[PDB]
Design a binder for this molecule. Structure first.
Ligand code: NA
Length: 96
């Protein structure tokens, strides 16, 4: 079951795996900066992290609006799947 506690960070998957890391981050920043101020965007090249990304917002209200408003938003011909990131995700701690 996905995380139900609102997190500053949203977890995104089903991203187009053809796009390189830096371009994916620039596009995500363009789409999600409209939900609120972004502190960081985490993308890994690892094999188990492809098609996935984290967006860390300065305020939970921005993350919540992103989750409710950008769910299924089509990018690179693929609808994004968004969840609240796991509370104190081990992945975020290492990546940030
Ligand atoms: Na919606």
């Amino acid at each position: 079951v996905p995380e139900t506690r609102p997190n500053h960070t949203i977890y995104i998957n089903n991203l187009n795996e053809k796009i390189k890391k830096d371009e994916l981050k620039k596009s995500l920043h363009a789409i999600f900066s409209r939900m609120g101020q972004i502190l960081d965007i985490l993308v890994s090249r690892s094999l188990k992290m492809r098609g996935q990304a984290f967006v860390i917002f300065k305020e939970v209200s921005s993350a919540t609006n992103a989750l409710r408003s950008m769910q299924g938003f089509p990018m690179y011909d693929k609808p994004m799947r968004i969840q609240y990131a796991k509370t104190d995700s081990d992945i975020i701690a290492k990546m940030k």
